[PDB]
Structures are given as structure tokens and as C-alpha cells.
Short mmCIF file of C-alpha atoms (C1' of nucleotides) and ligand atoms in Angstrom, two decimals:
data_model
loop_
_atom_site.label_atom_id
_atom_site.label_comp_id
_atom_site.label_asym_id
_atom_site.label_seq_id
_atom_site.Cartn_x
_atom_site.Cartn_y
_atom_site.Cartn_z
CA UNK A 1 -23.35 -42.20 8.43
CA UNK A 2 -20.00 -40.37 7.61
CA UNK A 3 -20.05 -37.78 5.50
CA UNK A 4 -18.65 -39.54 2.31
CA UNK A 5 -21.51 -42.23 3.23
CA UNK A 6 -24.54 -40.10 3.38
CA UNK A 7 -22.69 -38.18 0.12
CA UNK A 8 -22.62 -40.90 -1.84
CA UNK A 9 -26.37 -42.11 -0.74
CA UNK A 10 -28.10 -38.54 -1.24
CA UNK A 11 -25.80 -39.10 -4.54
CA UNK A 12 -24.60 -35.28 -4.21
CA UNK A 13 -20.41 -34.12 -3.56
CA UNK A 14 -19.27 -33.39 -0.59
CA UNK A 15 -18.76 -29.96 -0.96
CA UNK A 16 -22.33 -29.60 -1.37
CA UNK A 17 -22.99 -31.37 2.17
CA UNK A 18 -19.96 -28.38 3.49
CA UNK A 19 -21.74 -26.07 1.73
CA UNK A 20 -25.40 -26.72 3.05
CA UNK A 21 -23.89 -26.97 6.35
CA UNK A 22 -21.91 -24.06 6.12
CA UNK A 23 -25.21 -21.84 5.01
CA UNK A 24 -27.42 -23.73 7.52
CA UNK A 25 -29.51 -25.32 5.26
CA UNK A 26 -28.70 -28.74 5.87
CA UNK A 27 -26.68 -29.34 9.41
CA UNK A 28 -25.70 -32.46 10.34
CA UNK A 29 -27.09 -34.24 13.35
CA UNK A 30 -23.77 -34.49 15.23
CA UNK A 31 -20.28 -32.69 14.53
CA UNK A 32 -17.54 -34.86 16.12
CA UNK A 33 -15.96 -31.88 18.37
CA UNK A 34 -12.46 -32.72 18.48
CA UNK A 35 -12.07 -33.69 14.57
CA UNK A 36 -14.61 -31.87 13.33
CA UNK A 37 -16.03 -34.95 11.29
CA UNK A 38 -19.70 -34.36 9.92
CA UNK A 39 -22.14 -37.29 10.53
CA UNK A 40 -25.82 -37.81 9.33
CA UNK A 41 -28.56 -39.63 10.11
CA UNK A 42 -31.65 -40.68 7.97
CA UNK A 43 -33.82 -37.93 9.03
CA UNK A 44 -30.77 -35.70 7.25
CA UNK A 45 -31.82 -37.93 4.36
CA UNK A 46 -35.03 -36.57 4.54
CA UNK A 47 -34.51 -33.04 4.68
CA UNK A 48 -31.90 -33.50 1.42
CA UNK A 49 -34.77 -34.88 -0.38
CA UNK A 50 -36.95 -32.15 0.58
CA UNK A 51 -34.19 -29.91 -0.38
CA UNK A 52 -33.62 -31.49 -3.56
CA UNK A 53 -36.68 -31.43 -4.84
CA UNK A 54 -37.43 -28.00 -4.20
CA UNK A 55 -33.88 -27.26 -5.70
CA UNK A 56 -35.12 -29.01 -9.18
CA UNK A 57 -37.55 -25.95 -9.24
CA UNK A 58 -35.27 -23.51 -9.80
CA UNK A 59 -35.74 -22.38 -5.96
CA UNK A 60 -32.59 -19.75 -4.72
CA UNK A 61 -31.24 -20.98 -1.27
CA UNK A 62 -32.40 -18.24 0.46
CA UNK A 63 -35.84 -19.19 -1.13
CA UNK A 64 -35.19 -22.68 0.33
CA UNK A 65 -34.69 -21.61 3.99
CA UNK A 66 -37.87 -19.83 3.80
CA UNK A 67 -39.83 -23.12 2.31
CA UNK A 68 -38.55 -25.13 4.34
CA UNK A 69 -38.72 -22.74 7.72
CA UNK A 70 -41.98 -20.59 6.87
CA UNK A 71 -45.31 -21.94 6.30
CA UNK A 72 -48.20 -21.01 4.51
CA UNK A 73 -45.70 -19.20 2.57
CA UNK A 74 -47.50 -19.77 -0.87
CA UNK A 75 -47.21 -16.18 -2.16
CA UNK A 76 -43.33 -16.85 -2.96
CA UNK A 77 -43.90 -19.84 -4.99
CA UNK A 78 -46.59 -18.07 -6.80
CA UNK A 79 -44.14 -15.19 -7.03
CA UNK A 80 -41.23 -17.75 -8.64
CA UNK A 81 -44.37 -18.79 -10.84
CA UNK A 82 -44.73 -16.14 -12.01
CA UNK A 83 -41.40 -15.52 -12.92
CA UNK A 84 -40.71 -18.54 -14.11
CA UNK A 85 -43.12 -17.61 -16.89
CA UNK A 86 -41.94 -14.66 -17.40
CA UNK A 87 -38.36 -16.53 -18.45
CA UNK A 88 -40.72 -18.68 -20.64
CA UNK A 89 -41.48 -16.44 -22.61
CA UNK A 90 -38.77 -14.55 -22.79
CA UNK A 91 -36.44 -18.08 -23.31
CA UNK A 92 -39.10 -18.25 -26.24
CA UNK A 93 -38.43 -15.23 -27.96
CA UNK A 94 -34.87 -15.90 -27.61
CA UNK A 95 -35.57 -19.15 -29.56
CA UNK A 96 -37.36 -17.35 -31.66
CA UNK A 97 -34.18 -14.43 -32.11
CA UNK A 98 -31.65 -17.11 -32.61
CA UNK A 99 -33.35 -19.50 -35.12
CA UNK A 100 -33.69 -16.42 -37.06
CA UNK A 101 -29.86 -15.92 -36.70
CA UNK A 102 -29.25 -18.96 -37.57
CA UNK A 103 -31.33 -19.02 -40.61
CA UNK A 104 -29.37 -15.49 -41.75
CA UNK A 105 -25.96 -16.91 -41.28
CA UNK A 106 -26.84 -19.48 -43.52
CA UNK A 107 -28.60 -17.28 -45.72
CA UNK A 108 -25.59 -14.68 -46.10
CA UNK A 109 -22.04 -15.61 -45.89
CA UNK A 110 -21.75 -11.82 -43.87
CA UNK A 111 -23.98 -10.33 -41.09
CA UNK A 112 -24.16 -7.04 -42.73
CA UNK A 113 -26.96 -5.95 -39.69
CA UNK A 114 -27.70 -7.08 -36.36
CA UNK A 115 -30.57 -5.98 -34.66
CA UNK A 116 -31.19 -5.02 -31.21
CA UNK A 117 -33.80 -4.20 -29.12
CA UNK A 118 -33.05 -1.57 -26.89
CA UNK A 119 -35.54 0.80 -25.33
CA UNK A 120 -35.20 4.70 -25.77
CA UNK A 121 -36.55 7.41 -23.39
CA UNK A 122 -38.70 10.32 -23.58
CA UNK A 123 -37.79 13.87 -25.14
CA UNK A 124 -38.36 17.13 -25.54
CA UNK A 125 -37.56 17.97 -29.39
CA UNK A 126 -38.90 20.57 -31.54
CA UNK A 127 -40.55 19.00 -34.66
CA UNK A 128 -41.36 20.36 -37.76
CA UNK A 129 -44.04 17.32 -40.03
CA UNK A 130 -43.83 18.09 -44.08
CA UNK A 131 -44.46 16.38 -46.84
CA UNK A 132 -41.51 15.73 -49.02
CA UNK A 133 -40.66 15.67 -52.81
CA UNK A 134 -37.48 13.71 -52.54
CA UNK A 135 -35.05 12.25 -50.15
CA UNK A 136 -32.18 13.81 -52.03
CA UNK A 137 -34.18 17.17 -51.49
CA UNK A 138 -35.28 16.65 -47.97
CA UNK A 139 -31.69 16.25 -46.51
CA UNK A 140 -30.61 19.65 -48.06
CA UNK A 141 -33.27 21.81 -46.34
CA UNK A 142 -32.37 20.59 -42.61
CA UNK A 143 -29.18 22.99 -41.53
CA UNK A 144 -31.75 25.89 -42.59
CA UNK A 145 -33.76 24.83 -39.68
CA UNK A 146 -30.88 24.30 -37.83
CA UNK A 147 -30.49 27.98 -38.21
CA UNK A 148 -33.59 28.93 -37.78
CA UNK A 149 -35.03 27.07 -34.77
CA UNK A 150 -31.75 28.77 -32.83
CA UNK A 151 -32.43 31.77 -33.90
CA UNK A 152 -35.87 32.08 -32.74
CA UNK A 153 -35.10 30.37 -29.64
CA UNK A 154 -32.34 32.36 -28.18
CA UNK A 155 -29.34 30.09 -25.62
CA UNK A 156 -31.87 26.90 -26.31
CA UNK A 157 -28.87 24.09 -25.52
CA UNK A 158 -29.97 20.66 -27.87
CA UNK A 159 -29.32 17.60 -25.59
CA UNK A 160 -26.02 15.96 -25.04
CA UNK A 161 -26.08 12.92 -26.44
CA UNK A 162 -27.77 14.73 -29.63
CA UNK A 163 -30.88 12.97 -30.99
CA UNK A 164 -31.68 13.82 -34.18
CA UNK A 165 -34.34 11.98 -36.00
CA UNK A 166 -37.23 11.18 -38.65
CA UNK A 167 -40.72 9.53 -38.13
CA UNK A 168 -41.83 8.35 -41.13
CA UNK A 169 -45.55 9.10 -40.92
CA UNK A 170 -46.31 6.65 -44.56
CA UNK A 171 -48.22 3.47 -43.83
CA UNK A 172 -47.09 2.45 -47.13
CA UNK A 173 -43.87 2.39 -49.49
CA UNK A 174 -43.40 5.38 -52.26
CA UNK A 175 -40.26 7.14 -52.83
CA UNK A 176 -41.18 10.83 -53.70
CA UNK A 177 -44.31 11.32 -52.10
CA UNK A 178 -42.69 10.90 -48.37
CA UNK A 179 -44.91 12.29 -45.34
CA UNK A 180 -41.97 13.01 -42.77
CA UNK A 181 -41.91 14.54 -39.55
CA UNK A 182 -37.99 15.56 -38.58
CA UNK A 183 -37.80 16.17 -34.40
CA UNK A 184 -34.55 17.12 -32.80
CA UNK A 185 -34.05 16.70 -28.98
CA UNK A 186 -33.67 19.50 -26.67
CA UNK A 187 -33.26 20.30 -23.30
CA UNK A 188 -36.26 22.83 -22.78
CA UNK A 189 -39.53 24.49 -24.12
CA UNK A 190 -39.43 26.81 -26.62
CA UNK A 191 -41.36 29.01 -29.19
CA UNK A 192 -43.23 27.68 -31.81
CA UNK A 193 -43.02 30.44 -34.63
CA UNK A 194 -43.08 28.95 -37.89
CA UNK A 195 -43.80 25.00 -39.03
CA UNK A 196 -41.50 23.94 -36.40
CA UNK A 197 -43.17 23.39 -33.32
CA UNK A 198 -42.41 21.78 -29.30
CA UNK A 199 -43.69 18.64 -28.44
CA UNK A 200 -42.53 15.58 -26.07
CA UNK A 201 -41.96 12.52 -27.60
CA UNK A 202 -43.23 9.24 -25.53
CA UNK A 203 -40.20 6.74 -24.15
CA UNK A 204 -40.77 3.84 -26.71
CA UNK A 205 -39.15 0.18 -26.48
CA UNK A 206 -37.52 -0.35 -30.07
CA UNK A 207 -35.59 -2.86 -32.34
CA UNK A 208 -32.73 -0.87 -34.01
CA UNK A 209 -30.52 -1.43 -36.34
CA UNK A 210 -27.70 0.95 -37.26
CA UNK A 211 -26.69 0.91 -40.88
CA UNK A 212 -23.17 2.91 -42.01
CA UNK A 213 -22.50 3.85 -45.42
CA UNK A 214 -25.01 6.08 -47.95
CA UNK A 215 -28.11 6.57 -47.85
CA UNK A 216 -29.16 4.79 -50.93
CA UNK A 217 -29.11 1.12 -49.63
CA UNK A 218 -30.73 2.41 -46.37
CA UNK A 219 -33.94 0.59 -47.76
CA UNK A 220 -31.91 -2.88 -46.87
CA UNK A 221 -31.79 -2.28 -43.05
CA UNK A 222 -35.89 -1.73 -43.46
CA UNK A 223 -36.22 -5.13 -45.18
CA UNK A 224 -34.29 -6.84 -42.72
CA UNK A 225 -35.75 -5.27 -40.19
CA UNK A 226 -39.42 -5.47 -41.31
CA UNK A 227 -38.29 -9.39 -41.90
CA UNK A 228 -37.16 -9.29 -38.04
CA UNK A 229 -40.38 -7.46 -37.57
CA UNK A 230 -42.68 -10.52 -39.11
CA UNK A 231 -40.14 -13.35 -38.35
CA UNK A 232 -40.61 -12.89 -34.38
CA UNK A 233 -43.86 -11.93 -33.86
CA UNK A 234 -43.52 -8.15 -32.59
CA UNK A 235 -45.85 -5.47 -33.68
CA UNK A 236 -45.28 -2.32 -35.34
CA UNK A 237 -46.73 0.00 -32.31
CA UNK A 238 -45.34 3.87 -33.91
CA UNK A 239 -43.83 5.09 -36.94
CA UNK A 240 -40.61 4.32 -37.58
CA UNK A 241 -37.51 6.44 -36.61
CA UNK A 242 -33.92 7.50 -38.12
CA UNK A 243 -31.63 8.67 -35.83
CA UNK A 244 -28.46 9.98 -37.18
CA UNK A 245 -25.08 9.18 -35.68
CA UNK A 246 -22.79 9.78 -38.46
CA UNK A 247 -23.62 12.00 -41.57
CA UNK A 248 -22.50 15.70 -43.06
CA UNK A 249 -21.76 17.54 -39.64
CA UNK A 250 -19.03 15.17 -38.27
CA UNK A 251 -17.56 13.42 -41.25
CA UNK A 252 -16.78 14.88 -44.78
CA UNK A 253 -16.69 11.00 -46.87
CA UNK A 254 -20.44 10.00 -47.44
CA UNK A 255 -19.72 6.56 -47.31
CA UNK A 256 -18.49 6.68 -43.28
CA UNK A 257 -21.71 8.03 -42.92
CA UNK A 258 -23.57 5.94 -39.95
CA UNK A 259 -27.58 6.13 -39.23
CA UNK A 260 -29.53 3.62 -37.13
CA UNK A 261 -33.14 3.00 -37.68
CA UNK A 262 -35.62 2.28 -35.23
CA UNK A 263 -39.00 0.29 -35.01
CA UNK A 264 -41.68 0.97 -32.22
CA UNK A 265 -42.42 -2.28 -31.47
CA UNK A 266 -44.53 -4.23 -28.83
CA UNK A 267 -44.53 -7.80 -27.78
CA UNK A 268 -47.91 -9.71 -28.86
"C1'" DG B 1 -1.53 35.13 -13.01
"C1'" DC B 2 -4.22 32.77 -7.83
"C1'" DC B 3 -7.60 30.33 -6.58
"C1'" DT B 4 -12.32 27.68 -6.34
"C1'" DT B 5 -15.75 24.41 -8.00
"C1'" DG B 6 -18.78 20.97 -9.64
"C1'" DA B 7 -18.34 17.40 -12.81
"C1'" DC B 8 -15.94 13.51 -14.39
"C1'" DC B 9 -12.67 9.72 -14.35
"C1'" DC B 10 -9.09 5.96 -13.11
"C1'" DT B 11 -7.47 2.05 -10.38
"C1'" DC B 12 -8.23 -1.19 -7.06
"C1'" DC B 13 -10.53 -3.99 -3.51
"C1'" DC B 14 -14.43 -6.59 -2.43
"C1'" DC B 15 -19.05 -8.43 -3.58
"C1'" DT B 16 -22.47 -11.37 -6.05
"C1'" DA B 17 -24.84 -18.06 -6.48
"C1'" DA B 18 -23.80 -22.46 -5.55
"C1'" DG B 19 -20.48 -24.91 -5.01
"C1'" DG B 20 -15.45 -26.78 -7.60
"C1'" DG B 21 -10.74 -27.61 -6.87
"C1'" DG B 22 -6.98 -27.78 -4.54
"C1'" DA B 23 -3.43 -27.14 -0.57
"C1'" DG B 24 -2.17 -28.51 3.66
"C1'" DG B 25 -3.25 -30.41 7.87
"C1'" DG B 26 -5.20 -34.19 11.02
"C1'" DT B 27 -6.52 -39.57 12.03
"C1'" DT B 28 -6.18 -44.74 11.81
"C1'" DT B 29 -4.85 -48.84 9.48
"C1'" DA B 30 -5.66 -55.73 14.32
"C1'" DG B 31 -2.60 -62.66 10.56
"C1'" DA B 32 2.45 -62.08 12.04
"C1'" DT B 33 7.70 -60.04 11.59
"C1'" DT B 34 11.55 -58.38 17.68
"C1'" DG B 35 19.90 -56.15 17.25
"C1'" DT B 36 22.40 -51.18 11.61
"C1'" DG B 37 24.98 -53.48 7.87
"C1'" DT B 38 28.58 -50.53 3.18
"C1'" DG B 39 30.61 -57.02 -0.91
"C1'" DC B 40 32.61 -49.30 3.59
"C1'" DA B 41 37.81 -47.82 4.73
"C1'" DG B 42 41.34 -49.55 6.55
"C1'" DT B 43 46.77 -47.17 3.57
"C1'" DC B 44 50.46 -40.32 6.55
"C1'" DT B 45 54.41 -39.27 8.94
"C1'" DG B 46 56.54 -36.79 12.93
"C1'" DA B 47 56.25 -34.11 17.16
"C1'" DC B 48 54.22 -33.45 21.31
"C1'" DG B 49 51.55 -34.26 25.46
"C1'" DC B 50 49.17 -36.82 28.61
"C1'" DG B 51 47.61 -40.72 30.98
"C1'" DG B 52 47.32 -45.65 32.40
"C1'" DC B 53 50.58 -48.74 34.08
"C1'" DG B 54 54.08 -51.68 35.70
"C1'" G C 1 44.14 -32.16 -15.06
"C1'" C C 2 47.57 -27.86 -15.78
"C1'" A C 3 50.82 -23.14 -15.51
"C1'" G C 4 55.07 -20.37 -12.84
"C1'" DC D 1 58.40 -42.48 38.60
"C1'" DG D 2 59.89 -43.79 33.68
"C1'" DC D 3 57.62 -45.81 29.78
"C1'" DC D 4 54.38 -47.04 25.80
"C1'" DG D 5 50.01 -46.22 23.67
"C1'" DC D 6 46.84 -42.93 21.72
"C1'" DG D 7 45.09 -38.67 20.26
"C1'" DT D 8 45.83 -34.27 18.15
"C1'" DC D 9 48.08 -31.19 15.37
"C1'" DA D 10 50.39 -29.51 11.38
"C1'" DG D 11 51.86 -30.16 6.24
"C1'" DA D 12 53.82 -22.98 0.08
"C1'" DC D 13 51.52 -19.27 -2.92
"C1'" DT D 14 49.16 -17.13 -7.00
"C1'" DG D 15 46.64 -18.53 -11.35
"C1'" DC D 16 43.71 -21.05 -15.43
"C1'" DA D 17 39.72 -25.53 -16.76
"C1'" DC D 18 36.25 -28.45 -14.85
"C1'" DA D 19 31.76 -28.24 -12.91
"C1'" DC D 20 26.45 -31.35 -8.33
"C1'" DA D 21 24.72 -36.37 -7.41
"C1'" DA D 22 23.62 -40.16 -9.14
"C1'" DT D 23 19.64 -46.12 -4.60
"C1'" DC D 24 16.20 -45.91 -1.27
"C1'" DT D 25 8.49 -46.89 -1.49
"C1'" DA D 26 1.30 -45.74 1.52
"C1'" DA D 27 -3.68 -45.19 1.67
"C1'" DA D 28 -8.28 -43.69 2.70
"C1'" DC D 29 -10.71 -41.01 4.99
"C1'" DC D 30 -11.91 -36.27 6.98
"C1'" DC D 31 -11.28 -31.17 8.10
"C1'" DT D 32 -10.42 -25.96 7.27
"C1'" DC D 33 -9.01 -22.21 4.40
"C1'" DC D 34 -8.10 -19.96 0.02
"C1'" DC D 35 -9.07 -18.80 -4.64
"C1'" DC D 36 -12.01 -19.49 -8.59
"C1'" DT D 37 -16.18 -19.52 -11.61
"C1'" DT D 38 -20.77 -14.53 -14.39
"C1'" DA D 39 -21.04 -9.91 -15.85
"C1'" DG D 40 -20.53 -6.35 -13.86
"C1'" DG D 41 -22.09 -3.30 -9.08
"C1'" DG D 42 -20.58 -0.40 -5.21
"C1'" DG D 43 -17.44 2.55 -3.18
"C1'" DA D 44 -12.88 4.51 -1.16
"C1'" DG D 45 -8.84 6.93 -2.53
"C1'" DG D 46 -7.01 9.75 -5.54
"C1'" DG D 47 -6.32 12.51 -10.13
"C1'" DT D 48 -8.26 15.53 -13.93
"C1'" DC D 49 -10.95 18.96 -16.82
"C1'" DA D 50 -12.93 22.80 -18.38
"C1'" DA D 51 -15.45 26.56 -16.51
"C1'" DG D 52 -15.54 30.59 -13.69
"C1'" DG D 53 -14.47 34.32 -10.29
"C1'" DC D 54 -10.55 37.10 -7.81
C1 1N7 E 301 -42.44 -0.02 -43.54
C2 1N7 E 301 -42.74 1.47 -43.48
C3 1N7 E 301 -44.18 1.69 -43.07
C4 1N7 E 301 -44.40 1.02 -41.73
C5 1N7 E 301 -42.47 2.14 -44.84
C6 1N7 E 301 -43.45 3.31 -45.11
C7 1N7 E 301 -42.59 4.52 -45.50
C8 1N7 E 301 -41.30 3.87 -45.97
C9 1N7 E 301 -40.07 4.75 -46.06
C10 1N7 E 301 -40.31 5.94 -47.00
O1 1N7 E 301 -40.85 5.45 -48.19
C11 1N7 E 301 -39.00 6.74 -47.17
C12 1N7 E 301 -37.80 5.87 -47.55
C13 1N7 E 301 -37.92 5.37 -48.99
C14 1N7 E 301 -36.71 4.54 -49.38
O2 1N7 E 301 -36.97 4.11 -50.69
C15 1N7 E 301 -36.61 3.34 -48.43
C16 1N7 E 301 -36.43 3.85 -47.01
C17 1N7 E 301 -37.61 4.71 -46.56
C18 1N7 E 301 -37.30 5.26 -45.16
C19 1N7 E 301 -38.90 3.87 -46.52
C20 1N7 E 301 -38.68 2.67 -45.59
C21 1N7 E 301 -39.96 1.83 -45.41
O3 1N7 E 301 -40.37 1.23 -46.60
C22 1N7 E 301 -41.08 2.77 -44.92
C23 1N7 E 301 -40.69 3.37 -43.56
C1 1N7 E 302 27.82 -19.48 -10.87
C2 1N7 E 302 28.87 -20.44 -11.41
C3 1N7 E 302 29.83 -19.68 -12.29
C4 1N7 E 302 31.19 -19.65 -11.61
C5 1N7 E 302 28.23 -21.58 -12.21
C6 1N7 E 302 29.21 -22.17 -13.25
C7 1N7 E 302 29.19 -23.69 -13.08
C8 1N7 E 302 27.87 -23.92 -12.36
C9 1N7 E 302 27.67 -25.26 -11.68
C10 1N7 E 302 27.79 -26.41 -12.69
O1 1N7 E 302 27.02 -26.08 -13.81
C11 1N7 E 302 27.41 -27.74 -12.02
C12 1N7 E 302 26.08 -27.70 -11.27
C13 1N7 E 302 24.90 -27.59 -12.24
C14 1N7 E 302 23.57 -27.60 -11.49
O2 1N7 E 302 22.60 -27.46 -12.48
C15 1N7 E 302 23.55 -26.40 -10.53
C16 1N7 E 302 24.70 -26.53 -9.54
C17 1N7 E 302 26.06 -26.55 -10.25
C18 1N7 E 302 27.14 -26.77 -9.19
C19 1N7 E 302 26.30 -25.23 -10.99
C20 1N7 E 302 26.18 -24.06 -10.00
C21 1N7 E 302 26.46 -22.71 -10.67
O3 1N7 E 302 25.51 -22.41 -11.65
C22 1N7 E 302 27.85 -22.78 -11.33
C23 1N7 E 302 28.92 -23.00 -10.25
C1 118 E 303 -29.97 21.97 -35.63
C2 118 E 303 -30.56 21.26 -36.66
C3 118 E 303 -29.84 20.28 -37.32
C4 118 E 303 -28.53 20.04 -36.95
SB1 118 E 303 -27.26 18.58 -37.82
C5 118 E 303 -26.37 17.64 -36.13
C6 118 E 303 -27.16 16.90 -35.28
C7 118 E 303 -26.61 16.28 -34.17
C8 118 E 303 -25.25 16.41 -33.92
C9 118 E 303 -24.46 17.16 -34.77
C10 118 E 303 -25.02 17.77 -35.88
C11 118 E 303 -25.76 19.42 -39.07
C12 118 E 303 -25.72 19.12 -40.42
C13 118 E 303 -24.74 19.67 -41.23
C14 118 E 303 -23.80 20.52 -40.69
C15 118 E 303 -23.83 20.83 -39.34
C16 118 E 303 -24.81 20.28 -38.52
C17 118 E 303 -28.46 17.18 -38.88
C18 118 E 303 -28.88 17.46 -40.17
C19 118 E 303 -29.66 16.55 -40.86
C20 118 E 303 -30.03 15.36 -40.25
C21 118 E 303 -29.61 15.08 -38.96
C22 118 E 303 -28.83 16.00 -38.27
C23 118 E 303 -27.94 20.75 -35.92
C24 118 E 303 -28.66 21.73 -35.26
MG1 MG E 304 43.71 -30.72 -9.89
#
DNA sequence: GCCTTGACCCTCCCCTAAGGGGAGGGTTTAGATTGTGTGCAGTCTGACGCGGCG
RNA sequence: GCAG
DNA sequence: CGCCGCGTCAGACTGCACACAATCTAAACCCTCCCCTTAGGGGAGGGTCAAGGC
């Protein structure tokens, strides 16, 4: 059986039979030597449908080979189980991530937030966890600490890229009676005069979304997010973070401003 | 100024998986056919040299 | 095709 | 040795403008080699940037 033969009866190109030849996976039973002309047999049938139906399992080449030359080799098929279900699930939640796309384009004409779920490392900030009267009045008193925590910690260098955050500490929703805890990252330990305080903060997996503009719609990214949250099935594991990109110390117009909030969250 | 020095950084080349697509090369084709035809140009005269040829 |  | 046929060799110089050539046919197989597809990784070769000491 030529080549374009056997092709047409394993019902595959012939580039495929080249290429299974070419990788040793499939050789033919006897190369013509002067032409070069490939020719197959039925037990080359055989081993295609072997091949094939190995191949409809997802199965990498090199995978193949082994099947096909090793046996009692049962721990790699139990090992592409298990990541086959492992792409399950995660094809799942992607279902999950684009129906609820899908039902926000539809929703609004604009995507005014995507969200993205990224995962964040450990740090070493120093902390300082207050109650607070008022947003308004909680942004104000920061730069004093700024001035403070490097004074009492003399050449203590803050990490490059800066992270400079809020864990909101509230299991519910108020608007003056805030429990906050600010933490700024920085590269060593430190001394822990006054309300501020050294402490590492965990590596966390989190959705964020980054929201530009003031401060006052902020709340919207939270809904969305806490929508996102519900919508596919992830749970609220910490408190949530603000990390601040954008604000007073790089930009003078308030309404350039850029934060991105972030919500501890594991997959149940 | 004269140097070093570690940290960055850019471009470019090749690599990934499983073949697709194409370029550019080979090979055989088993009824029997068996001598080129342009509706060609040919149309320029005079001098000179050389060679068959009686 | 033309010019001298 | 003298003559006729045949072949070869020439045929003003500058300029513009215009403008070439135009018909004329195989197909079905196979092979190798090259470049391409994702979403970036890995690394050689070669600049560049703040820092510091001489
Ligand atoms: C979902 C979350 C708990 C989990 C609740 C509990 C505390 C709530 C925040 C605070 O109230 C401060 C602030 C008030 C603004 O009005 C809206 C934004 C802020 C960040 C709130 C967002 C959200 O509502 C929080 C995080
Ligand atoms: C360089 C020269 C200027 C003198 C230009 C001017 C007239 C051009 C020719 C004509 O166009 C006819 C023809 C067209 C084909 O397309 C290409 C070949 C031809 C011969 C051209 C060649 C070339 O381009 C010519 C000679
Ligand atoms: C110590 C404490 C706070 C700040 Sb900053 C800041 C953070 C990261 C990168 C750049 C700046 C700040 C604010 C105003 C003027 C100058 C610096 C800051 C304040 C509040 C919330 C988040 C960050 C800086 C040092
Ligand atoms: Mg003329």
C-alpha cells in the first residue's frame, strides 16, 4: 500500500504519515531505497489505530512512544488523568469567567472594570491597625507616618516596586465607623515604637481590580467585584486590600488618581 | 577628570507541538500514429579572388 | 518618419 | 591554362521622435527541504546607566 493508499484508508494526510515516520512513531514497513517511496502494510494499519486512539486522549507524542513502547506504564496515564481534571476544572471556571463577561457586556454598553486574578507574594511591611472616623480623614493622617516610621527607623529602604496598602478588617458595610489596618512594604525589620508595628504579610492568590479616578465611586469596583466574588463561586479567604498605584505623591489631578483593590480569595 | 563595577537592557537567532503548505525535484504513463513545412523570401550592385572545368 |  | 560560377566584401556623419512581440498545450503520483503556525523562553553579542572609588 503506497503511501497516498494507506493515507487515504487510515483517513489521515500525508504529512501526518511523513511526520510519524520522521519522529519514529509510525515507520513504514519498507522504504523503496532508490526513490525513497514509503509503503505500508496492514499491520501499519494497526499500529495507526492504536496511535489514533490514544491520540483522541489528548496523549503528547512523546507520551505515545512511551505507551506504545513501555509497559505497565499506568502511572503516566494516571498522571494525564489527573491533569486532565485539573483542565476540567479550570476549563470550568473559565466558563464560568466568560458567561459572566458576557452577561456584563450586555449589561453595560462599557467595561468600566475587568478583573483579574493574579497572585501576590509575601512581605515585610510595617503596619499600623486603627479605627477610623472617616475616609476623607483617614487619607490625611498617612504622610505623618510616612515621616515618622523613617524617622524611627533610620536608612530603612521601602521596596521597589512600592506596595502600599489597606486591609479592611469590617465584616460588614458602614462608612464612618471603618476598622483599617494600613501596611507598607519594606525591605527589612525594624522597630516597633509607637502604633506602627513589623509584621510579614502571607503570599495570597487574589482577584484585583484596579479602579482610576476618585475615591468616591471606589465603592463600584467592590460591587463588581463582590458580584465576581458570588457569580463564580470563589471564597472570600482574608480581608480585602487597596493597593495604591496612582494618588497624591505622583500625580497632582485627583481624578488620574489610580488604586486597585484586591480580594483574598480561594477556589471552593 | 580616569577608571571600575554590578546591574540592566536591546536586538537577533533559534526553540517550542503537530503537522500545513508549498517549492522544486524525481518517476511512469502499453490501442495505434514512423521524413520539418512558413500560403517564408526570393528582389543589390560591383569588385575581387578562387576554384572547378573544358 | 524627420532635420542639416 | 584561360574562363565562368560563386562567395564575400563593402556601401557618409551628427542629431531629434518612436519605442518590444504579438501562435504554439500534461498528469498523477512520490520525495526532500524550507518556512510557517502559539506565546513567549533561552542565550550570545553587544550597549548603557547610575553608583562609586582613584
Ligand atoms: C465587602 C467588605 C467586607 C468583606 C466590606 C466591609 C468593609 C467595607 C469597606 C469599608 O466600609 C470602607 C469603604 C466604605 C466605602 O463606602 C466603600 C468602600 C469601602 C472600602 C468598603 C468596601 C466594602 O463594602 C467593604 C470592604
Ligand atoms: C530606458 C529607455 C529610455 C531611453 C526606455 C524608453 C522606452 C522604453 C522601451 C519602450 O517603452 C518599449 C518597451 C516597453 C516594455 O515594457 C519594456 C521594453 C521596452 C523596449 C522599453 C525599454 C525601456 O524602458 C525604454 C527603452
Ligand atoms: C511612607 C508612608 C507613606 C508614603 Sb505615600 C507613597 C507610596 C508609594 C510610592 C510613592 C509614595 C505619599 C503621599 C503623599 C506624598 C508623598 C508620598 C501613600 C500615602 C497614602 C496612601 C498610600 C501611599 C510614603 C512613605
Ligand atoms: Mg527612419
Amino acid at each position: 500500500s503506497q503511501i497516498g493508499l494507506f493515507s487515504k484508508i487510515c483517513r489521515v494526510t500525508i504529512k501526518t504519515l511523513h511526520y510519524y515516520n520522521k519522529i519514529g512513531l509510525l515507520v513504514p514497513a519498507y522504504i523503496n531505497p532508490d526513490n525513497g517511496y514509503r509503503f505500508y502494510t496492514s499491520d501499519q494499519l494497526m499500529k495507526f489505530h492504536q496511535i489514533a486512539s490514544l491520540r483522541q486522549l489528548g496523549f503528547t507524542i512523546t507520551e505515545i512512544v512511551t505507551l506504545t513502547q513501555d509497559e505497565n506504564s499506568c502511572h503516566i496515564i494516571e498522571r494525564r488523568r489527573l491533569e486532565i481534571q485539573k483542565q476540567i476544572r479550570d476549563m470550568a471556571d473559565m466558563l464560568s469567567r466568560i458567561n459572566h463577561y458576557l452577561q456584563h457586556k450586555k449589561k453595560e454598553r462599557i467595561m468600566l472594570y475587568q478583573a483579574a486574578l493574579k497572585e501576590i507574594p509575601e512581605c515585610i511591611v510595617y503596619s499600623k491597625r486603627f479605627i477610623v472616623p472617616d475616609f476623607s480623614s483617614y487619607i490625611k493622617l498617612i504622610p505623618p507616618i510616612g515621616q515618622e516610621v523613617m524617622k524611627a527607623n533610620p536608612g530603612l529602604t521601602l521596596t521597589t516596586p512600592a506596595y502600599c496598602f489597606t486591609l479592611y478588617h469590617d465584616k460588614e458595610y458602614k462608612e464612618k465607623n471603618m476598622d483599617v489596618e494600613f501596611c507598607e512594604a519594606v525591605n527589612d525589620f525594624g522597630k516597633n515604637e509607637g502604633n506602627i508595628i513589623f509584621q510579614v504579610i502571607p503570599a495570597i492568590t487574589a482577584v484585583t481590580v484596579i479602579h482610576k479616578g476618585p475615591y468616591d465611586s471606589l465603592r463600584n469596583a467592590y460591587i463588581y467585584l463582590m458580584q465576581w466574588v458570588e457569580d463564580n463561586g470563589y471564597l472570600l479567604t482574608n480581608s480585602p486590600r487597596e493597593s495604591y498605584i496612582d494618588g497624591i505623591w505622583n500625580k497632582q489631578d485627583s481624578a488620574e488618581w489610580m488604586t486597585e483593590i484586591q480580594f483574598p480569595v480561594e477556589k471552593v
